[PDB]
């Protein structure tokens, strides 16, 4: 499934290593980014419109 | 195609002032390291000075003169068969490939220390008995039968 994974993620386990990070609006544990509790596709799409304050296209 | 592009120039050696020795520096250089190559350089000159003492230079450009090539091979086709004929080539590439032959035949030795085997191929080449001059003889000799398209170069 897809939604029940999100539901069980937001729960509280009994051991401290059960937790797995994902995004909360569009979560994808596959290639997870815990830098901001987001996902790679999610960060990419929000960056296009500019929904993140500090997001910029990389300049060298 | 490649329109026009001048190549890089070498700098005079601070202790030899010889373009030939700079090309030696370049050819024996491996892994982007100068100091290790420079150690081999110092050992080579010192040992050439040590065993049968002469003048590092005199024997050096003597060997360079002996290994001077004549004709370099290039291949043409009728789209179905390769024919190899030799043409001319400037002096810089001649010297570079001659010193490359020297270094390659140097590394393909089986004595213990590098410095002594290096001095060995150098004195052998200066004596017209090393392996470096053999391929020059071969590239001069093949023109006996490759004259058919050495006449007309395309």
């Amino acid at each position: 499934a897809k939604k029940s994974l999100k539901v069980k993620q937001t729960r509280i386990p009994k051991f401290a290593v059960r937790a797995y990070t994902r995004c909360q609006r569009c979560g994808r544990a596959r290639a997870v980014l815990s830098h901001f509790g987001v996902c790679r596709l999610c960060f990419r799409e929000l960056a296009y419109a500019g929904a993140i304050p500090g997001v910029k296209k990389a300049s060298w | 195609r490649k329109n026009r592009a001048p190549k890089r120039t070498v700098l005079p050696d601070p202790v030899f002032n010889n373009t030939l020795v700079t090309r030696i520096i370049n050819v024996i250089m491996e892994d982007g390291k100068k100091g290790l190559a420079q150690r081999i350089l110092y050992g080579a000159f010192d040992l050439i000075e040590q065993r049968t003492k002469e003048k590092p230079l005199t024997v050096f450009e003597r060997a360079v003169g002996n290994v001077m090539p004549r004709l370099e091979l290039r291949v043409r086709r009728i789209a179905g068969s390769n024919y190899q004929v030799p043409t001319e080539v400037p002096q810089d590439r001649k010297i570079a490939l001659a010193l490359r032959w020297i270094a390659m035949f140097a590394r393909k030795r089986h004595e213990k220390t590098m410095l002594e085997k290096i001095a060995n191929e150098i004195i052998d080449a200066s004596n017209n008995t090393g392996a470096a001059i053999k391929k020059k003889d071969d590239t001069h000799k093949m023109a006996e039968a490759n004259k058919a398209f050495a006449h007309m170069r395309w």
Partner: protein
Amino acid sequence: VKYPELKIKLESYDSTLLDLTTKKIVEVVKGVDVKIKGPLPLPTKKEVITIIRSPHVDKASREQFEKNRHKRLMILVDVNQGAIDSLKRIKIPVGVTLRFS
């Protein structure tokens, strides 16, 4: 002296807005107190985050984004509360935070 060692750190994620905020605050504090040292330029915390573009098979076609955080320092030993009052006339914009001790 009234409140020694006003060491206020300002944080923003840009350099141009950093320039604006620094100019604003270090020129509004003039007019009321003396002995203000120059704002020392500080290195920028750069973060490059390389990101896969396609949702499928490629690791070569990855873009990359930037996040740069900036900061400036104000070290004030000999001051009066006049500068503290002056801090409440023109507000720093919402993208800049303050650190104090």
